[PDB]
Amino acid sequence: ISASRKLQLKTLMLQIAKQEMEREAEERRGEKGRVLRTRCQPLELDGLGFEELQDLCRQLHARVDKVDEERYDVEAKVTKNITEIADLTQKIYDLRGKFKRPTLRRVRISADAMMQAL
Amino acid sequence: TTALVCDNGSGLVKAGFAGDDAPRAVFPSIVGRPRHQGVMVGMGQKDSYVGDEAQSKRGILTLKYPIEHGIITNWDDMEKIWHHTFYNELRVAPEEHPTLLTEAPLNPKANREKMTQIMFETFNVPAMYVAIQAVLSLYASGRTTGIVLDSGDGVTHNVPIYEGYALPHAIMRLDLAGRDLTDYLMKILTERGYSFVTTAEREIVRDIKEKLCYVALDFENEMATAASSSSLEKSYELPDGQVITIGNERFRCPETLFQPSFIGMESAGIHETTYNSIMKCDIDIRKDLYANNVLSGGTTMYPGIADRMQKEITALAPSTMKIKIIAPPERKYSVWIGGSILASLSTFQQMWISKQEYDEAGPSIVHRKCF
Amino acid sequence: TTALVCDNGSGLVKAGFAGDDAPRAVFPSIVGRPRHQGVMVGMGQKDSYVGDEAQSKRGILTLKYPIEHGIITNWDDMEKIWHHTFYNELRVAPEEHPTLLTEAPLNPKANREKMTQIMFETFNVPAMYVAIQAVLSLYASGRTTGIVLDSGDGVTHNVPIYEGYALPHAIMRLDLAGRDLTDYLMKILTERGYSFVTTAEREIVRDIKEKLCYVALDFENEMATAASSSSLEKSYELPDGQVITIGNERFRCPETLFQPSFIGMESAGIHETTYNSIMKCDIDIRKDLYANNVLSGGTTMYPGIADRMQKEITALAPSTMKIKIIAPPERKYSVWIGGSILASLSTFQQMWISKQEYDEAGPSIVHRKCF
Amino acid sequence: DDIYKAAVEQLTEEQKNEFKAAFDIFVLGAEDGCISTKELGKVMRMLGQNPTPEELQEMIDEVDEDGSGTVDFDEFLVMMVRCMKDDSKGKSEEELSDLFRMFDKNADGYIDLDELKMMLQATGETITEDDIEELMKDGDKNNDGRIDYDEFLEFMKGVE
Amino acid sequence: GKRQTEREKKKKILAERRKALAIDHLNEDQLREKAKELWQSIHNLEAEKFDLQEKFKQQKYEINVLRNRINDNQ
Ligand SMILES: Nc1ncnc2c1ncn2[C@@H]1O[C@H](COP(=O)(O)OP(=O)(O)O)[C@@H](O)[C@H]1O
Ligand SMILES: Nc1ncnc2c1ncn2[C@@H]1O[C@H](COP(=O)(O)OP(=O)(O)O)[C@@H](O)[C@H]1O
Ligand SMILES: [Mg+2]
Ligand SMILES: [Mg+2]
């Protein structure tokens, strides 16, 4: 078929995919927000004595430090993920650099203007 | 700041700031004192014209190259050339710019140490680094393997590299280069009557070689054809008239590359030292080196050399391997383009020889880890 | 969850999840540091290429196997190999999977204890179990009796089993295996002019051995035929051209198995150590062992060995017994298939060495009831 | 017309006036404004940024195939938008990776032809045997059993 | 890999994450305000950990993709 028509169809597909990705991102954001709302339970502090409220706060802070520990664990895991991502990128660039070393440079800076000085 | 990628070479000094496509200023490296007496007073006659200025007043000068074969034989003249390059062709004081010189393989140590001592004491650069002229030419091709034949004007050297690991035991450096071809052409021109003797007329013979000579695909057939017909005789106009006609001197001058017995050298041509350099490598990387043979340097610009060399190597090599010869159109400045690319890298930014390091270990720092 | 059936071996590491037909990832067990200098900057050059990656860059590496003869001589390299196997070839963290290593018979204790200590401390598996490499090969054949000759690449061992009761006093372990055959082939190739010396070229000689060599049915007749005609000379193309022609080296390399006097070893061939292993057994189970002789391991893949061995044993054995040699087409992975079957059993599910047990008794738990 | 009018706005009304002045520069002039057809080659000669032979071939396919001897304003601007650099640089590497990951619903590490067909028909475009099969010839260059990662990464180079 | 060093780093970071405050030095409204503030802080904790999980999932998918494409070489 004609190249222009196929290119137009490819452009239509890419734009539709981008729109779907943005809509799915909106869905992910809303779903994550709602789930986060569900994770944190409502607090009813009305008519709470010093002992009850203080104990509840201490329990909440203990759970907070537990969350700190879990976030440290998942942080170590995500750093491992980042490290292996970097290793994969390094290996891929190594495979591509068998023929793509002179790719990164800048040429034709100022010498193309200077011609009639001599 | 930006780095200065200088490239001393031997015959043409090529320099320019890192990160561009072509050197900013390219000019012959000759320093010529006047030789006659001089009678006009107040004409403002200097004592030494360097660079491209001495290619216009060459009628009354005695040009003498300060670099013979890679090595530097006259340090005062080389210092003068560097001073000119920094101050008049680039107009950037060296106190605020790193420099990246280039050096042929297997050169004397004292040359490199004196070079770094000059750059650190006289010009007082912040940091300088010396790199082998073939690795840069491999950078410019965008490869990471391959065996590069860098036939400059001073010395022809053939450095094989695989996967970034250079093979130091397989470097074959041969001292036949463009200058010997100029001398041989000047010597065979005498067979028709044209005598060039003065050191100024060597430049005219060099121009003849550049504009007319070409490498024959098959030597004997060309010798037979030029001896019967007259379709090869190309004429050329000297700087004063009296056109000359070059016959079979056209392809006999650059043939010396493949038969160094013409100028009395014993060694084998550039077609067989490449095969020998390959065969010294390990048995498992010979296919890749066969497929990625790289040409560089000025003297490899002869019309028709990328076919003669491929034919010769295909004759020598096993019949199954594929022989491919990479001959980019920007051959002459390949080393400098590679130098610019290398100086523009972020990973390389900590390999410079910083001045405080030189102050602590002396000029012998160059042979150390900072190579 | 699923169990990891790893099988260290010596020459090829075979691994995969329990319950399949073939190992998921099979790759040579070699770790090769680069040996040259390396001039390209930023190429991303690592310090050690392991597994199948070092069989492609072997031109500039010095490959060295971490397992010599069953035993492990270089624990750091073996740890590196295991780490690669778990993380890159299977991509399953070991924190959530039991492992089933395999070990040759009659190996040093310290090797096994160090293996279990590594698996429990570094990789931190839930539970690991070590099994003898011949019982698995007997599992894969679907038998329950029989004497199995598992001629691997490191060590050849011959474990007889009857009705599920192994006979510990009749195990005949011989240290001739595929590696010694590779070295002997590399040594007899020099009789035609081909010299392979580098540790990288040992791989080329191994490929020659795999693709060309075969076991002769009768040795003297083949030696006489190859010395008169030329119907045996098969040619082979090196990794760079220059084809080579192997004459009577074809059946002389694997003949070392049946005459270990060729490489100077005193002991008797694999045709006579099987008969000796049988004769040490009781007088009433010799018929069953004669009828169910099993072959396994890589080195028993030579074309024509299942007939030579049967002829030899029939010559040695009494004339009435029937000699049958089981040679399944999936010989190479027989041990691993058996390992998968064993790990998939429900009755076996309580034999693993659980981590709490190791914490209570130390690494010496492996010699205890949990064998 | 949506893509057509987008290309129209690519060379906006200011650029339209500039190129109309240029057209008056290289037109025959001193005439009724009947508009010739050779002006599309005259602009190629005048600009220095000569259109590629692909654009001229497209013009021949579109115009002068019937020997009209003139170029429509619509066809003239069609040719003009085909010479100026209305490039999109082929999106971005991250954008390509995201779009291809969404295309790889099966997470196969590549794109399958069924995946391609579903993605295309999810846009509403008529994807029949004239598609896919031609795209097997055209969209998939390797045709090595699937559409591998580098195949479609390089396939959408410099495209919209 | 040298889990002692990892545990020491965990201890240092947790000490950085350690928050010890007054528990019997505020009135009922101040106590309720502190409870609400702690609730909001751990709510931000839940949100951030959800983000971490999502980004880790994305990273793992990209790791699988890159591993597949690098194995596709040969
Ligand atoms: N177009 C050309 N054709 C043939 N020979 C050339 C051409 N250009 C340069 N040369 C030869 O190459 C030499 C320049 O080589 P060059 O690469 O500048 O050496 P260096 O490595 O010292 O820079 C000149 O002396 C000349 O003899
Ligand atoms: N098709 C074959 N023909 C001949 N020899 C082979 C063949 N395949 C493998 N081998 C030999 O067997 C060895 C592999 O044996 P293997 O069973 O993998 O040992 P391990 O018991 O350590 O796994 C190789 O080193 C090779 O020498
Ligand atoms: Mg040079
Ligand atoms: Mg085995």
Short mmCIF file of N, CA and C and ligand atoms in Angstrom, two decimals, chain B residues 7-14 65 133 150-155 178-179 182 206 209-211 213 297-303 331-333 335, ligand 1:
data_model
loop_
_atom_site.label_atom_id
_atom_site.label_comp_id
_atom_site.label_asym_id
_atom_site.label_seq_id
_atom_site.Cartn_x
_atom_site.Cartn_y
_atom_site.Cartn_z
N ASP B 7 46.99 17.73 17.85
CA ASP B 7 47.45 16.48 17.25
C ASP B 7 48.70 16.79 16.44
N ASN B 8 49.87 16.58 17.05
CA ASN B 8 51.11 17.06 16.45
C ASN B 8 51.31 16.49 15.06
N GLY B 9 51.18 15.18 14.91
CA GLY B 9 51.38 14.64 13.59
C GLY B 9 52.79 14.90 13.11
N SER B 10 53.00 14.66 11.82
CA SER B 10 54.28 14.96 11.20
C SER B 10 54.01 15.35 9.75
N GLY B 11 53.89 16.64 9.51
CA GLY B 11 53.56 17.10 8.18
C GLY B 11 52.40 18.06 8.17
N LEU B 12 51.41 17.83 9.03
CA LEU B 12 50.28 18.74 9.20
C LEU B 12 49.86 18.71 10.65
N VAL B 13 49.89 19.86 11.31
CA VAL B 13 49.41 19.98 12.67
C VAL B 13 47.92 20.28 12.63
N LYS B 14 47.12 19.46 13.28
CA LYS B 14 45.67 19.60 13.28
C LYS B 14 45.22 19.85 14.71
N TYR B 65 61.32 20.34 8.71
CA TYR B 65 60.34 19.75 9.60
C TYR B 65 60.98 19.43 10.94
N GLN B 133 47.81 7.11 18.60
CA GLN B 133 47.12 7.67 17.44
C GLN B 133 46.16 6.70 16.78
N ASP B 150 47.14 3.02 10.28
CA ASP B 150 47.17 4.48 10.29
C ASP B 150 48.43 4.97 9.59
N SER B 151 48.36 5.02 8.27
CA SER B 151 49.53 5.36 7.46
C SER B 151 49.64 6.87 7.35
N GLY B 152 50.29 7.48 8.33
CA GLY B 152 50.45 8.92 8.34
C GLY B 152 51.47 9.39 7.32
N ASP B 153 52.10 10.52 7.65
CA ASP B 153 53.18 11.04 6.82
C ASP B 153 54.55 10.72 7.41
N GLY B 154 54.62 10.49 8.70
CA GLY B 154 55.89 10.12 9.29
C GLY B 154 56.09 8.62 9.36
N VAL B 155 55.13 7.91 9.94
CA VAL B 155 55.30 6.50 10.25
C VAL B 155 53.96 5.79 10.10
N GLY B 178 54.40 8.83 4.03
CA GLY B 178 54.26 9.78 2.94
C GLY B 178 55.55 10.49 2.58
N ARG B 179 56.40 10.77 3.56
CA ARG B 179 57.63 11.50 3.27
C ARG B 179 58.56 10.68 2.39
N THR B 182 57.31 10.86 -1.05
CA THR B 182 57.68 12.11 -1.70
C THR B 182 59.11 12.06 -2.19
N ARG B 206 55.54 17.24 -3.49
CA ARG B 206 54.43 16.75 -2.67
C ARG B 206 53.10 17.08 -3.31
N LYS B 209 52.46 14.71 -6.10
CA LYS B 209 52.06 13.41 -5.59
C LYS B 209 50.61 13.41 -5.16
N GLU B 210 50.19 14.45 -4.46
CA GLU B 210 48.81 14.50 -3.99
C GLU B 210 47.83 14.57 -5.15
N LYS B 211 48.12 15.39 -6.15
CA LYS B 211 47.12 15.63 -7.17
C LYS B 211 47.10 14.59 -8.28
N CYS B 213 49.16 11.17 -8.42
CA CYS B 213 49.45 9.76 -8.20
C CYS B 213 48.22 8.99 -7.76
N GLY B 297 44.63 7.90 8.44
CA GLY B 297 45.82 8.64 8.08
C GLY B 297 45.76 9.22 6.68
N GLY B 298 46.61 10.21 6.45
CA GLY B 298 46.58 10.91 5.18
C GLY B 298 46.95 10.03 4.01
N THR B 299 48.04 9.27 4.13
CA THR B 299 48.60 8.58 2.98
C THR B 299 47.68 7.52 2.42
N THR B 300 46.64 7.14 3.15
CA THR B 300 45.69 6.17 2.64
C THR B 300 44.59 6.82 1.82
N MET B 301 44.84 8.01 1.28
CA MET B 301 43.87 8.72 0.47
C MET B 301 44.12 8.55 -1.02
N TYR B 302 45.05 7.70 -1.41
CA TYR B 302 45.32 7.51 -2.82
C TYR B 302 44.11 6.90 -3.51
N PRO B 303 43.74 7.39 -4.66
CA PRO B 303 42.57 6.83 -5.36
C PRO B 303 42.81 5.40 -5.81
N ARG B 331 38.97 10.47 6.00
CA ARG B 331 40.12 9.71 6.46
C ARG B 331 41.17 10.60 7.09
N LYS B 332 41.46 11.74 6.47
CA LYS B 332 42.60 12.54 6.89
C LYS B 332 42.47 12.98 8.33
N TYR B 333 41.28 13.45 8.71
CA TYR B 333 41.06 13.96 10.05
C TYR B 333 40.45 12.91 10.97
N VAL B 335 41.83 10.71 12.96
CA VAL B 335 42.46 10.70 14.27
C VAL B 335 41.97 11.88 15.09
N1 LIG F 1 44.65 13.78 -1.04
C1 LIG F 1 45.83 13.16 -0.85
N2 LIG F 1 46.29 12.25 -1.72
C2 LIG F 1 47.46 11.63 -1.54
N3 LIG F 1 48.28 11.85 -0.50
C3 LIG F 1 47.94 12.74 0.45
C4 LIG F 1 46.67 13.45 0.32
N4 LIG F 1 46.58 14.27 1.38
C5 LIG F 1 47.69 14.09 2.12
N5 LIG F 1 48.50 13.17 1.57
C6 LIG F 1 49.79 12.75 2.12
O1 LIG F 1 49.62 12.58 3.52
C7 LIG F 1 50.47 13.45 4.26
C8 LIG F 1 49.66 14.07 5.38
O2 LIG F 1 49.39 13.02 6.29
P1 LIG F 1 48.78 13.34 7.73
O3 LIG F 1 47.66 12.37 7.99
O4 LIG F 1 48.56 14.81 7.81
O5 LIG F 1 50.04 12.97 8.65
P2 LIG F 1 49.94 13.11 10.24
O6 LIG F 1 49.57 11.74 10.72
O7 LIG F 1 51.33 13.56 10.62
O8 LIG F 1 48.87 14.15 10.43
C9 LIG F 1 51.01 14.48 3.30
O9 LIG F 1 52.41 14.62 3.52
C10 LIG F 1 50.77 13.89 1.93
O10 LIG F 1 52.00 13.35 1.45
#
